[PDB]
Design a protein around this nucleic acid. Structure first.
Ligand SMILES: [Mg+2]
Ligand SMILES: [Mg+2]
Ligand SMILES: [Mg+2]
Ligand SMILES: [Mg+2]
Ligand SMILES: [Mg+2]
Ligand SMILES: [Mg+2]
Ligand SMILES: [Mg+2]
Lengths: 141, 21, 117
RNA sequence: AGUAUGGGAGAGGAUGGUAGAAUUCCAGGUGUAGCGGUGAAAUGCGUAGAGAUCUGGAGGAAUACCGAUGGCGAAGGCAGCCAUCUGGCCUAAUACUGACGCUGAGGUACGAAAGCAUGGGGAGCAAACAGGAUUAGAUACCCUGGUAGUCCAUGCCGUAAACGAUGUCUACUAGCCGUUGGGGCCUUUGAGGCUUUAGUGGCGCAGCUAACGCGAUAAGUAGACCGCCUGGGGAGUACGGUCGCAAGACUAAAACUCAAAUGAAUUGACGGGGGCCCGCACAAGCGGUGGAGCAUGUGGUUUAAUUCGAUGCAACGCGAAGAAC
């Protein structure tokens, strides 16, 4: 827009846990409007990480998601034909989006039977520090 | 560094004419 | 090796390339670094992003002597003139003085012609 | 109109001496792999030792701030500092000669830069020239080297948008705001304020002009003298003549051809002219095409025909909402 800005769209929280972060994660996982399979995947992964260490899912989920969250990003700004790559400030929403994307790709490229089990495994590996999603996130780069 | 053998008189006269107004 | 610890800095700044040399007060050179050794190899050598890295590499190479007394001299205009002292402070050197010492001629020789485009 | 006396300002001119910054080169100390350049590269330089820094010398040119709405000069033009010679201008009134004045065809003097002749000098810059790029082509703009020249002394040349595109001299005709050199008055009470001259700027009444504009520094109202113009091109050209070492300069037509060439202003249109704004136009996000197989339309080739149209966006699953007869 050029004249006036538009307000961001707000999403309703999920029916199961009443958390908006879980809803946004399911929206990021969902493809072609198939919300049911995404909900099944997310709920299965949440329960799988829950019964391994008995803590309610939303606490562990947010605490682990904050771990892989980045702080700044670098885009190219052309001035004299060069990249001149430098970091820039970003809002928390852009960081949460990048974290969710990196996590859902790292869990996807893993090898297991179903999407729920590999998602739970990737969540645990990123939580205790054995994950590759935190490896994609680099400080100096 | 460059030279403008003719130009500085024109340039300063434009300078003063534009500064007075 | 020497460790007199009063080495001066000569930050030559030009539109095409920037040069920084670390030498003592008398003038005997100690260590130098340039954007040529950096590896941009072109017009990007003029960017201020290379000047700071050149200055920091010069400072790391000089600290082997034990440099902490800084006498900086900047000559010539262009970008990257201010980034060198910024990086040299970022590594943590103590400052004695900063001043501008670029030479302007008192009616020197005839300059080249104007580039029309 | 001019002379003598006492004061003032100034890059006015000629000659000589002297100072600093900066560029180039010659070494010397340490150090040394890149340096230089363009929108992008290369020509070019460097491991013999590059570039940067410091110290000592050699040479040439120009005088950074001061510097200005300046100042001086008939014009061209004149800027570091000091010394010598010299021209002009402004300012106060006392005396002095008493029209001794203005202009001026021929003539004569000076006259930017470039160019020419003789003898030196040559740091930087740079016609011609060489190489590397870009372009379909580059002979040029761009980059790297570089000779005449730019500098000095003695002469020639006598041309410029040599412009204020406005000849010299004299007298008269509303105002407002600045500046430079003098003189006078008021409380030099303080760089202050008010009037008078000689220069230099910005608005503006009357008036003038086709308009733009000028407007006490007239392009206003008047007088004296000189130069110059009579549609565009041919043409400031041919011939003749004068001057010059040369380049060339001055004076200066005709035949022929056209019915236009021009000045100022008005409305559109355009601008790789400057500002302003909008658009799923850019930035962010999701999903595609361009790659594979098939359906469909078009261009090409073949055939007896492969019926005819639509052809950048705005033609190509378009006329055709449906060709086995
Ligand atoms: Mg006369
Ligand atoms: Mg003439
Ligand atoms: Mg004339
Ligand atoms: Mg007027
Ligand atoms: Mg002639
Ligand atoms: Mg295809
Ligand atoms: Mg057809």
């Amino acid at each position: 827009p050029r004249r006036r800005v538009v307000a961001a769209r707000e999403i309703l929280p999920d029916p199961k846990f009443s958390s908006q972060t879980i809803a946004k994660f399911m929206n990021h996982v969902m493809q072609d409007g198939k919300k049911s399979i995404a909900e099944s995947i997310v709920y299965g992964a949440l329960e799988r990480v829950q019964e391994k260490n008995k803590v309610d899912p939303v606490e562990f989920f947010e605490t682990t998601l904050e771990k892989v969250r980045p702080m700044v990003e670098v885009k190219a700004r052309r001035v004299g034909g060069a990249t001149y790559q430098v970091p820039m400030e970003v809002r928390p929403s852009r960081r949460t989006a990048l974290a969710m994307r990196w996590l859902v790709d790292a869990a996807a490229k893993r090898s297991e039977k179903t999407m729920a089990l590999r998602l739970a495994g990737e969540l645990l590996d990123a939580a205790e520090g054995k994950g590759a999603a935190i490896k994609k996130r680099e400080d100096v780069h | 560094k460059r030279e403008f053998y003719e130009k500085p008189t024109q340039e300063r006269k434009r300078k003063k004419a534009a500064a007075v107004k | 090796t020497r460790t007199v610890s009063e080495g001066v800095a000569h930050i030559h700044a030009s539109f095409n390339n920037t040069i920084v040399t670390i030498t003592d007060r008398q003038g005997n050179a100690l260590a130098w670094a340039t954007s040529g050794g950096q590896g941009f190899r072109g017009s990007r050598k003029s960017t201020p992003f290379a000047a700071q890295v050149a200055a920091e590499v010069a400072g790391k190479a000089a600290l082997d002597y034990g440099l902490k007394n800084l006498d900086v001299l900047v000559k010539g205009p262009g970008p990257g003139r201010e980034s060198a002292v910024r990086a040299l402070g970022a590594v943590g050197y103590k400052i004695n003085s900063i001043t501008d010492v670029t030479p302007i001629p008192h009616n020197g020789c005839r300059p080249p012609k104007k580039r029309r485009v």
